[PDB]
Amino acid sequence: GLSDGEWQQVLNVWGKVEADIAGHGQEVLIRLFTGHPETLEKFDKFKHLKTEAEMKASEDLKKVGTRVLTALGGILKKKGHHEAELKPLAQSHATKHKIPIKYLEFISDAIIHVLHSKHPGDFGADAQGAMTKALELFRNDIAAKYKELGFQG
Ligand code: HEM
Ligand SMILES: O=N[O-]
Ligand SMILES: O=N[O-]
Ligand SMILES: O=N[O-]
């Protein structure tokens, strides 16, 4: 699904995120909210924010971005064997807060963009390819739980 070497390329670049979960989390969310303003409408706590200066100063947004990349790192490090980690994630993105699968695609794109901007010597062509497939797998498995939970994502 991913080869062992693709997982290695994923885990390597991810190691670089661990040195600043929070800074990365902010840059991913700013990239997401700026490329795709409608996604910001999903976060009741900071949906009123308008500009990037405001996003950068939000503690709530920073905390959300830390929680996203913390939960994703846990899932990636399972290297595909992530049924347990995915279960609560699917339940929360499909019930109270309904996150379209398309929005997981937007945030995937934003993660890939930030890793490339920040860690390019750790994220060449094949490594971007691998990360792209690892995120596709994550969304695919999430969409499958969406169905069981009665959310057409
Ligand atoms: C890599 C993709 C993502 C990951 C790993 C992720 C992870 C998480 C985690 C750990 C939580 C806290 C779970 C909890 O509240 O019990 C959460 C909650 C939430 N997320 Fe995400 N998230 C992702 C994508 C998104 C996107 C793209 C959006 C909106 C566009 C979003 C919107 C929300 C909202 C509204 C909540 C609160 C849900 C609740 O009250 O339980 N998430 N996410
Ligand atoms: O994307 N916040 O869970
Ligand atoms: O913008 N993706 O490298
Ligand atoms: O758009 N910042 O690489």
From Swiss-Prot:
Sites of Phosphoserine modification: 3
PANTHER family: MYOGLOBIN
Residues annotated to bind nitrite: 64
Pfam family, any one: Globin
InterPro entries for this protein: Globin, Globin-like_sf, Myoglobin
Name of the featured protein: Myoglobin
Catalytic reactions on record: Fe(III)-heme b-[protein] + nitric oxide + H2O = Fe(II)-heme b-[protein] + nitrite + 2 H(+); H2O2 + AH2 = A + 2 H2O
Chief location bin: cytoplasm
Residues where heme b binds: 93
Subunit and interaction comment: Monomeric.
Gene coding for it: MB
GO BP term, example: oxygen transport
Organism in which the protein naturally occurs: Equus caballus
CDD domains: Mb
Listed EC numbers: 1.7.-.-, 1.11.1.-
Localization (cell): Cytoplasm, Sarcoplasm
